[PDB]
Amino acid sequence: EQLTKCEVFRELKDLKGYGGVSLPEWVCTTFHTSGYDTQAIVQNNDSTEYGLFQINNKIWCKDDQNPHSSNICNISCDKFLDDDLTDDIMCVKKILDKVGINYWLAHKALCSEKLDQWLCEK
Ligand SMILES: [Ca+2]
Secondary structure (H helix, E strand, C coil): CECCHHHHHHHCHHHCCHHHCCHHHHHHHHHHHHCCECCCEEEECCEEEECCCCEECCCCCECCCCCCCCCCCCCEHHHHCCCCCHHHHHHHHHHHHHCCHHHCHHHHHHCCCCCHHHCCCC
């Protein structure tokens, strides 16, 4: 499910300013993390990342590949592949509170400058 820039802008409302991260920074971070695809699945080494935010199953959510996950978000990873981003966002908040925005390697590298390009109107 490939969302558009403004659909992401609209759906990530509850993250606005959280942890001091602006909405524009989030639209930018999710693109360079999953390309706006809520069904994105990437697995490198002993880890598989899920959804729009690419939440790993190493410590955030539990899945099949790793039953022994810390599962800090207390949720099955498959819940990060549907169209409802509510539970994804709740988990993102736990990630921000704990490891911070740097979980998303893309934020520092490309989403800390030039943010106006990522805004929407109306
Ligand atoms: Ca979800």
